[PDB]
């Protein structure tokens, strides 16, 4: 099979699809969809909240604060 990979959405691009942008600086971009491409022009980062696309990791929240702290012996 093929697939391509989205340098924006992070997601795999399904075979027989996507658009390739060739830029002046000669970086090569693969955009899965036109949704993806527009936002890259706009200079919306993908980490920023585009779907939210490229996020979807995990890790996160606290436990435990109380006191961010120092002195108080």
């Amino acid at each position: 099979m093929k697939v391509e990979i989205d340098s924006f959405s992070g997601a795999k691009i399904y075979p027989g699809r996507g658009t390739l942008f060739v830029r002046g600086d000669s970086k090569i971009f693969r955009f899965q969809n036109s949704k993806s491409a527009s936002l890259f022009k706009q200079r919306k980062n993908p980490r920023r909240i585009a779907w939210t696309v490229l996020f979807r990791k995990h890790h996160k929240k606290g436990i435990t604060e109380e006191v961010a702290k120092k002195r108080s012996r």
Partner: protein, 388 residues
């Protein structure tokens, strides 16, 4: 030249005149292929319904390009093509004045189908209680057969009365679309016989067409309604700022001739015209299951034909299907009739077939490709998603 310097082809063809409503809902093929090969196991045509469109990936061929070799995508129209009842053999004879039918030979079983023959085909939908089909006239196949004996003493190119059994899935409609399909093949006496064997039983798409083979598609276009010159003919709007009439022609004709010719572009009807689009490669014939699907990997992976949610406004396909190359005329949920290519010829064109990598299936558009992503989304939802 009095005018124009500066003269261009006339937009819009005179052969696709009149641009008028079709006589019938269903396309009718005027002539068919010739009697070259095997007997009437070979029906000249088959019918179906346009489901939507999908795209497929295939092993190409055209050695001259550098782009030649590997998988390459090609457009497909999917048509659901159920087993069709050849009900009868109609005998049309050639004479001078024209053909007139000698007979129709009936099978024992058309039962709902004759009710559908009564629907528009007679008229009135369960309206007042009947409509009627007369019963097989106390075993008087003899009437039908003596009339069969009459067809063998000459020659239509032997023909068959057919219907599409629409009830299968996508159409809310139950009513059959009756068809005249020509039979072509070998010697005439065996031709009557094979045609005879066929009526006794239903006929599949597997019997008529081989995969990849060149099929002419005839169907009836999408209907706009009543339309102006610009969409119809493809003529321009007149830009200006101001116009008494904006999207206009300048002159219908000239001072002489006094009359608006038919040859000139005019508003009127558009769409719902018969049209024949020629030499379509039949990429796949099959069933959703269990002819097969896809290998796995490889050649390439198993994929049900429908896109998720169904094709818009069609519904879902789950039965016999035929994948045809490119476009096919009509909208969706319309009869398309398939014919073996009339046009001998022969030239180059597709000269080798095209090994099935993919259907599509998608599972895409912000997710996909099927098995794994549906599982992946399901962990994440979960409740509204499927499974629980």
């Amino acid at each position: 030249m009095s005018h124009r310097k500066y003269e261009a082809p006339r937009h819009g063809h005179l052969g696709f005149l009149p641009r008028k409503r079709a006589a019938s809902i269903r396309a009718r093929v005027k002539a068919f292929p010739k009697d070259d090969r095997s007997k009437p196991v070979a029906l000249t045509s088959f019918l179906g319904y346009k489901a939507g469109m999908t795209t497929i990936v295939r092993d190409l061929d055209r050695p001259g390009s550098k782009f030649h070799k590997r998988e390459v995508v090609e457009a497909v129209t999917v048509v659901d093509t159920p087993p069709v009842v050849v009900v009868g053999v109609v005998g049309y004879v050639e004479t001078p004045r024209g053909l007139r039918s000698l007979t129709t030979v009936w099978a024992e079983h058309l039962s709902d189908e004759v009710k559908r023959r009564f629907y528009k085909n007679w008229y009135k939908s369960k309206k007042k209680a009947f409509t009627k089909y007369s019963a097989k006239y106390a075993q008087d196949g003899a009437g039908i057969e003596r009339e069969l004996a009459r067809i063998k003493k000459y020659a239509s190119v032997v023909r068959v009365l057919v219907h599409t059994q629409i009830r299968k899935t996508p159409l809310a409609q139950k009513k059959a679309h009756l068809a005249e399909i020509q039979l072509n093949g070998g010697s005439i006496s065996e031709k009557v016989d094979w045609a005879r064997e066929h009526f006794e039983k239903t006929v599949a798409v597997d019997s008529v067409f081989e995969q990849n083979e060149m099929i002419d598609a005839i169907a009836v276009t999408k209907g706009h309604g009543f339309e102006g010159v610009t969409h119809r003919w493809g003529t321009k709007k007149l830009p200006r700022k101001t116009h008494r009439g904006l999207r206009k022609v300048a002159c219908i004709g000239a001072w002489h001739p006094a009359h608006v010719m038919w040859s000139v572009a005019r508003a009127g009807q558009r769409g719902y015209h018969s049209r024949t689009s020629i030499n379509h490669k039949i990429y796949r014939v099959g069933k959703g299951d269990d002819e097969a699907n896809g290998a796995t990997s490889f050649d390439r992976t198993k994929k049900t034909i429908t896109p998720m949610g169904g094709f818009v406004h069609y519904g879902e396909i789950k039965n016999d299907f035929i994948m045809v190359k490119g476009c096919i005329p009509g909208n969706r949920k319309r009869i398309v009739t398939l014919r073996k290519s009339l046009y001998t010829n022969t030239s180059r064109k597709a000269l080798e077939e095209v090994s099935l990598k993919w259907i599509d299936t998608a599972s895409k558009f912000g997710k996909g490709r099927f098995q794994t992503p549906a599982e992946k989304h399901a962990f994440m939802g979960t409740l509204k998603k499927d499974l629980g």
